[PDB]
Ligand binder design. Structure first.
Ligand SMILES: CSc1ccccc1N(C)C(=O)N1CC[C@H](C(N)=O)C1
Ligand SMILES: [Zn+2]
Length: 140
């Protein structure tokens, strides 16, 4: 589990969005596994606006933050799970690192701020849904 809190927005994995989230929807994209809901209080996370390919992510199944190198956002095939059939997920970045299903939502950060959240993984890999292209998260 986990979320990004920027301005009056809450960014979570779409497959983990609560009942409170769909009743306050701003934008969602199933192909990206992202959902953004509106919040009453202002958040303090800064979104990175960069092309970094190294950062640090939080891994809840190990209670540890790990430094990682990751690929640029791309269209990647993701196996079937209880949340989606087998499909291509877009804007996904992969790294070599530990992840278990409940690690989704952990933040990936670089020197510029938040890059994305854990969204996929297994077999010694971890995949992150990029949020750096969502420029509107910074305004209105
Ligand atoms: C860190 S995800 C993970 C970890 C280890 C094993 C498997 C996983 N997968 C694949 C997983 O449970 N999902 C649920 C939905 C998600 C998605 N974006 O499609 C992927
Ligand atoms: Zn950066």
């Amino acid at each position: 589990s986990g979320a990004i809190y920027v301005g009056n927005y809450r960014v979570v994995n779409r497959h983990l969005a609560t009942h409170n989230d769909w009743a306050n929807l701003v934008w969602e994209d199933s192909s990206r596994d992202l959902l953004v809901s509106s919040t009453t209080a202002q958040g303090c996370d800064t979104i990175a606006r960069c092309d970094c390919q190294t950062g640090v992510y939080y891994c809840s199944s190990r209670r540890k933050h790990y430094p990682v190198s990751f690929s640029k956002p791309s269209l990647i095939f993701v196996e079937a799970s209880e949340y989606y059939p087998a499909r291509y997920q877009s804007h996904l970045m992969l790294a070599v690192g530990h992840s278990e299903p409940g690690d989704c939502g952990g933040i990936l950060r670089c020197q510029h701020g938040v890059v994305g959240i854990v969204s996929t993984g297994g077999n010694g890999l971890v995949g992150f849904a990029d949020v750096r292209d969502l420029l509107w998260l910074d305004e209105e």
